[PDB]
């Protein structure tokens, strides 16, 4: 149950604060299982807001809750987020075209990202289509 006021707080060091907050609100409103959190990325001092949780991905007439983490850089939305698939203990990363060994996601949408054409809602829409065709994680057989 986060609020825009709290989100603005998390992005005090960001270059485009309202734009980041506005899009975060749009994302967590449509995708109920994505939660905003202020955490450290790589270094304890590199605090950034990220959206963690799952997104609904239909795969062959069945919906799966794919675990992801979207790190919003302090330059969002002018630079793309850094995205990862976060496998749980019951699954394994499927390294392939759009996902590397570390679970980092690669997509044309991210590679050519540019404001205002690119946004998080558009990105997640792409993920749903792409992952629906080629799941980035699979359950342990």
């Amino acid at each position: 149950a986060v609020s825009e006021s709290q989100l603005k707080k998390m992005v005090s060091k960001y270059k485009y604060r309202d734009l980041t907050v506005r899009e975060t609100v749009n994302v967590i409103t449509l995708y109920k299982d994505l939660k905003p959190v202020l955490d450290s990325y790589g270094t304890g001092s590199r605090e950034l807001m990220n959206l963690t949780g799952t997104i609904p991905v239909p795969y062959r007439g069945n919906t799966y809750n794919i675990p992801i983490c979207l790190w919003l850089l302090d330059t969002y939305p002018y630079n793309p987020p850094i995205c990862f698939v976060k496998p749980t203990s019951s699954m394994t990363i499927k390294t392939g075209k759009h996902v590397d060994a570390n679970g980092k996601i690669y997509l044309p949408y991210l590679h050519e990202w540019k404001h205002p054409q690119s946004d998080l809602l558009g990105l997640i829409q792409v993920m749903i289509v792409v992952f629906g065709d080629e799941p980035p994680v699979f359950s342990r057989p």
């Binding site: 299982d33 809750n65 794919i66 675990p67 496998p87 019951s90 699954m91 799941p135 699979f138 057989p141």
Partner: peptide
């Protein structure tokens, strides 16, 4: 609301 993934082929 629990993470899930499809079974392998």
């Amino acid at each position: 609301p629990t993470p899930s993934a499809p079974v392998p082929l």
